[PDB]
Amino acid sequence: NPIIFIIILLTIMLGTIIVMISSHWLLVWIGFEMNMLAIIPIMMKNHNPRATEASTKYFLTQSTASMLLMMAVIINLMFSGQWTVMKLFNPMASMLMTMALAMKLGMAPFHFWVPEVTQGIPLSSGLILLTWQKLAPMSVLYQIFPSINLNLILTLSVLSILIGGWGGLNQTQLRKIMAYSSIAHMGWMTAVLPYNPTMTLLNLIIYIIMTSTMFTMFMANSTTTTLSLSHTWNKTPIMTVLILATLLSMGGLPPLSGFMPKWMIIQEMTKNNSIILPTFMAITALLNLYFYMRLTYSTTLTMFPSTNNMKMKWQFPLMKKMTFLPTMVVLSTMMLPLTPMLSV
Amino acid sequence: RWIARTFFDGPEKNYERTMAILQIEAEKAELRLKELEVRRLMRARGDGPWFHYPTIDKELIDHSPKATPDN
Amino acid sequence: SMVYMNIMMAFTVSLVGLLMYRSHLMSSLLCLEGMMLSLFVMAALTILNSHFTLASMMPIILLVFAACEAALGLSLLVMVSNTYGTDYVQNLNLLQ
Amino acid sequence: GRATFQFLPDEARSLPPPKLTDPRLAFVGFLGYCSGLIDNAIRRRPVLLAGLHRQLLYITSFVFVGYYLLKRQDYMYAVRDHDMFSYIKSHPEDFPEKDKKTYGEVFEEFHPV
Amino acid sequence: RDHWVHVLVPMGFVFGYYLDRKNDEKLTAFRNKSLLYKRELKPNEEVTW
Amino acid sequence: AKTVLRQYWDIPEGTECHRKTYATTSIGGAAGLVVSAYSVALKTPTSFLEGVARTGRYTFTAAAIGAIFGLTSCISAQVREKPDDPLNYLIGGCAGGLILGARTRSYGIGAAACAYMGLTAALVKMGQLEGWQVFAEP
Amino acid sequence: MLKYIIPTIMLMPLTWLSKNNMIWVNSTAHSLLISFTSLLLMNQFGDNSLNFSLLFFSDSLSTPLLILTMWLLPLMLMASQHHLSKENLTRKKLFITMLISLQLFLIMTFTAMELILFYILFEATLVPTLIIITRWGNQTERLNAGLYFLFYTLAGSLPLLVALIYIQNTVGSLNFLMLQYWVQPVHNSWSNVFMWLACMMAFMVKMPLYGLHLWLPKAHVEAPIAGSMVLAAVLLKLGGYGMLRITLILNPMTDFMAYPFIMLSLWGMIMTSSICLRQTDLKSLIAYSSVSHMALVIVAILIQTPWSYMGATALMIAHGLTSSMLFCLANSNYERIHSRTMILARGLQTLLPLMATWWLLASLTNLALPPTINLIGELFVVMSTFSWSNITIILMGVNMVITALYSLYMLIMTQRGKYTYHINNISPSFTRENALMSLHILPLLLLTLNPKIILGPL
Amino acid sequence: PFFDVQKRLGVDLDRWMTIQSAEQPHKIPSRCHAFEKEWIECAHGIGSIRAEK
Amino acid sequence: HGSPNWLKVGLTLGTSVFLWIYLIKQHNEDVLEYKRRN
């Protein structure tokens, strides 16, 4: 078990390398085919039947998310037959390209693909592995880019933040609260992509870091919202300020660095005179903070820490590269004169 | 009489600083009116390498007399 | 040609309401491997007549992963029926 | 934009460079000075001016990284401006030589109150 | 010790004021103006830059 | 399709109120069809005459509001002074919303029906007037 | 500011670095030393303009405005020590640092040199003020008022980024207000109306209107410990001066649609004064007064043409000292009676005769005694809008008549008999209660000696 | 995104199973072999945005 | 007393000065490289 637990973990990133390093439609077929075969035993380890009744819902979704891709691949074999990763030379194929590929980056359609998976998994350790599946198909879209029907890609993005802004008003499961708002940032970096595909990854990098800090701060004891009442006066009061340092940043306020892509997202989006569409998104992003307020009101205000059981013992977790993470996640908004020069 | 020359100056520093930092502007607000001239309106020419997209590499073609004369 | 039109309707046995529904859940996964051979042949039409001679490995290496993907999800339905005895996709407890 | 898979090419030798003692290289690592204090503050140090080896090498991390990061950043605007001027220099019809007139021709609106 | 918590902190003012002349000494663009402010022949418009 | 909207802004211009709303009820007649699709698949299994969905009559609401959506224009765009104006096209928003006020009764739902539906109507002919584009390109 | 933010950021590694209860006497001691440095390098001459150093400071040339920003931090620490001393020392010092951090963004603000640095500093607040409402406030219904403290200012301010970058990519660059010499006119369209609309409406979120102002008697009603950040919230409301920066240029000629901002701020002016003569709260009593003659300044600006910029320069600081002083009166008489309801305070004027003088002169700044800094600017608002038309004196004059009752409605409540109660409320107005009550009129009438510095360009 | 490791270090992952006329192990051509050899020659230095025009 | 592990304490302090030495040896080279080239 502990030898191959690295080996299974090793081949996941081996999959997404082959997605990035190829000029061939059949290798990128294989690429996130073997990824979908490498995620399954991570879901299992304690062999609980709820984990099995979550992975199989995860399974046959991504099976079709594989198998629909190849149906697009044989069309531009019948249409000019070249296999370089380029324009698809058929709008009937590019339609079949994107809205199959959008399953693995789950949009406003394919609703319960995200929450029903992430809720019900006992492994709340991670399950940060669902950032890799946010990383691999974005590394195809940078190359599909100059042949899209241009209306389908923006329609899924306007709907993306519309449902994600609504989902967590009806929630206590902080996994589902973090399952939602993963639709939110995946609407923005699609909505840039017709206008300068560079600086899309700027939204991608900031989203990785502010989700990496979130579950590592959730790996103290908390899995339920009212369980985040009983740690300030029980586990550690130092965690209570630090969790307020991130939930307010990821809402996007300008003195923190969570606002930083949405600062730059308009400088690109206008100057190409699309005005009514960024205004509808930024006003929707107001609702992205009322998840966090009404959640930060619970942990930072000492809301009745009952159940007398005092932790006089020390803590030994594995906070691996943890304390160096919210130093570019708060105070980096002055520290990006050109993030669009090293990445772009 | 002994307040100015003990502390600060008049029209020898706060003038010609206005003439100084308003020459950092005409090379800033005018080069920002060249990006819109060039990036948004490049457009169908694609001369300057900003809209340069890869097509194919002709190095990997072959030229041998392959064994069918009419191909 | 008409040999491309059929088979192209034969690809539309991947009807999604008959791909995860209803119960006797093996009938769902049935047409998944049944969605294979509608792509093995349809590729092998165009590769064969237009004499490519190099992409012959492509439908062969297709069927390598086609059973290998099909090998995984069949195992999990045993693990469904390990604690239950029947598949019955109307089984639902873990909600969203 | 040619000669891909490079961190920074060998065409980047005409850089000043973006040297030390800028406030950014000061700032890159200034947060790292605050960062290692938090590493004490998580695991109940409780000292907050702790052992120097944990109090250091956060400083050594960002400072060498930040200087090695700024070298391509000034290069990237330079190569962005390196491409722009020739396309400005070419196509004289796409860059009109406008005539400047003084404030004797302009009859503006005119709207007083 | 010698109370660095005390008046050493307002001593940072001239530490800021010593840095406060570095911006002006690189703003040495124009001497030739017509607001007298002329820099005609004198060592008076040259000084205090 | 975009042939329907191409047949909307070109010919009538307030006039020809016989075929004005005949081109304008089709969008309203097609709009309830989309929500009827989810009302049988997301809402649970209905009676033995599917589609037999939960409240029903969604097309029966949608085709009526889309009928009066062009009708209140081509009446008022004919009778006031004969342009299409933001003040002129405002009137179609209020009473067209109150079918959703008449059905599913008022005082909490129909009271906002004239409220929100009117302001979003007047921006449309304002939108084509100043040269605005939602989905532009360089 | 060459080195003004530079000494005050060094005050921050001094709170938790220090000893025990010495932290109050140390923090006040350093703080007043910066106040001379503010006075010294500023107040220079002076003829269009003092571009200060570079791209981060234009020296607040036309309106000084910055002296008032720096009184308050060595003024509230003596006020907040009334009811704060019950917690851990590390938790109390955090409450000290966040208020000091509030000043540093506002030190760079009000000068700001630009517009793209303006908005990030225009939104750099609301982070420390919100935390003060959450922790160490008063009784419940805090959290909704914290949400109403958001979701208005952030709701209106977001189209400024829609507006400003639309200007930056169109005509030049908004880094320099002084490179705004070429300004194209703006005609009446259906696109340009919204261009002026987003340019203005965000500034109505902070200085209120008859609309959208329900949040303002929440933060002042449900408020921190004893008027602690409430004094800072006075400068937070008056600090929406940036309309003076922007609409002086950048579509000036759109006055055809000025009228519904003239009218709504005018009938709402006379109304919200009388909306509090039947109010039952002290901290709400000054709050609705702070709406009315703060809504006076808006018609002084949208109406252009100076003899209106003269008084409007002075009317920002008019209640800015006065309502700050009234909150100091309301922060007192609460450590002794632990409910803020005004009706329970019958039988005063006899137990505290020393502060009874301070009730008199404070409310004598609303009647305002025409040789002061209050009725020297309100006469110029008369001098402007009477040239507009002859009707405008009517609704504006009754505002000078309603607050005549509305101020003396509070003074007479102190005079009653036999007090029925109060074996507590013994304390005969200790040193902290009256020395902090000073230093408000003491610069105010001092500025009435030679009121030359309180004047715009103008 | 497309890092292109095979450009710097000079091995091909595949790059051969790409077009209709690359390798042909015993020099046996395809049916439309004669038009690949022309259509590649048209747009090689073209940056694909004017190639469709 | 004092109880470190006596292995890693000093490796951190020596690697830094090595990276301090590798810093300016890259820097004072490249400072001379701009003049030697341009």
From Swiss-Prot, chain B:
Function: Accessory subunit of the mitochondrial membrane respiratory chain NADH dehydrogenase (Complex I), that is believed not to be involved in catalysis. Complex I functions in the transfer of electrons from NADH to the respiratory chain. The immediate electron acceptor for the enzyme is believed to be ubiquinone.
Descriptive protein name: NADH dehydrogenase [ubiquinone] 1 beta subcomplex subunit 5, mitochondrial
Complex formation: Complex I is composed of 45 different subunits.
Full-protein interval shown: 119 to 189 of 189
Family per similarity comment: Belongs to the complex I NDUFB5 subunit family.
Location in the cell: Mitochondrion inner membrane
From Swiss-Prot, chain C:
InterPro entries in the cross-refs: NADH_UbQ_OxRdtase_chain4L/K, NUOK/Mnh_C1-like
Organism domain of life: Eukaryota
Record's keyword annotation contains Translocase: yes
GO BP terms in the entry: ATP synthesis coupled electron transport
Membrane-spanning residues: 1-20, 28-48, 60-80
GO terms under cellular component: mitochondrial inner membrane; respiratory chain complex I
GO molecular-function term, one example from the UniProt record: NADH dehydrogenase (ubiquinone) activity
Gene3D superfamilies: 1.10.287.3510
Enzyme class: translocase
Primary localisation category: mitochondrion
Enzyme Commission (EC) number: 7.1.1.2
Compartment(s) of residence: Mitochondrion inner membrane
Keywords, comma-separated and alphabetical: Electron transport, Formylation, Membrane, Mitochondrion, Mitochondrion inner membrane, NAD, Respiratory chain, Translocase, Transmembrane, Transmembrane helix, Transport, Ubiquinone
Membrane topology of this protein: Multi-pass membrane protein
Catalytic reactions of this protein: a ubiquinone + NADH + 5 H(+)(in) = a ubiquinol + NAD(+) + 4 H(+)(out)
Keyword Lipid biosynthesis: no
Oligomer status and interactors: Core subunit of respiratory chain NADH dehydrogenase (Complex I) which is composed of 45 different subunits.
Function: Core subunit of the mitochondrial membrane respiratory chain NADH dehydrogenase (Complex I) which catalyzes electron transfer from NADH through the respiratory chain, using ubiquinone as an electron acceptor. Part of the enzyme membrane arm which is embedded in the lipid bilayer and involved in proton translocation.
Record-stated family: Belongs to the complex I subunit 4L family.
Record's protein name: NADH-ubiquinone oxidoreductase chain 4L
Name of the coding gene: MT-ND4L
From Swiss-Prot, chain D:
Function: Accessory subunit of the mitochondrial membrane respiratory chain NADH dehydrogenase (Complex I), that is believed not to be involved in catalysis but required for the complex assembly. Complex I functions in the transfer of electrons from NADH to the respiratory chain. The immediate electron acceptor for the enzyme is believed to be ubiquinone.
Top-rank taxon: Eukaryota
Lineage: Eukaryota, Metazoa, Chordata, Craniata, Vertebrata
Keywords, ordered alphabetically: Acetylation, Electron transport, Membrane, Mitochondrion, Mitochondrion inner membrane, Respiratory chain, Transmembrane, Transmembrane helix, Transport
Protein name: NADH dehydrogenase [ubiquinone] 1 subunit C2
Disulfide bond residue pairs: none
Modification after translation, per record: There is a minor unacetylated form of subunit B14.5b.
Oligomeric and partner information: Complex I is composed of 45 different subunits. Interacts with TMEM242.
Membrane topology reported for the UniProt record: Single-pass membrane protein
InterPro entries, sorted: NDUC2
Keyword Flavoprotein listed: no
Gene Ontology BP terms: mitochondrial electron transport, NADH to ubiquinone; mitochondrial respiratory chain complex I assembly
Location of this chain's protein in the cell: Mitochondrion inner membrane
GO CC entries: mitochondrial inner membrane; mitochondrion; respiratory chain complex I
Swiss-Prot record, chain I:
Gene Ontology cellular component annotations, sorted alphabetically: mitochondrial inner membrane; mitochondrion; respiratory chain complex I
Keyword field: Electron transport, Membrane, Mitochondrion, Mitochondrion inner membrane, Respiratory chain, Transit peptide, Transmembrane, Transmembrane helix, Transport
Compartments reported by the entry: Mitochondrion inner membrane
Transmembrane segment boundaries: 6-24
Its membrane topology: Single-pass membrane protein
Family that this chain belongs to: Belongs to the complex I NDUFC1 subunit family.
Quaternary organization: Complex I is composed of 45 different subunits.
Protein function: Accessory subunit of the mitochondrial membrane respiratory chain NADH dehydrogenase (Complex I), that is believed not to be involved in catalysis. Complex I functions in the transfer of electrons from NADH to the respiratory chain. The immediate electron acceptor for the enzyme is believed to be ubiquinone.
The protein's name: NADH dehydrogenase [ubiquinone] 1 subunit C1, mitochondrial
Biological source species: Bos taurus
Species classification: Eukaryota, Metazoa, Chordata, Craniata, Vertebrata
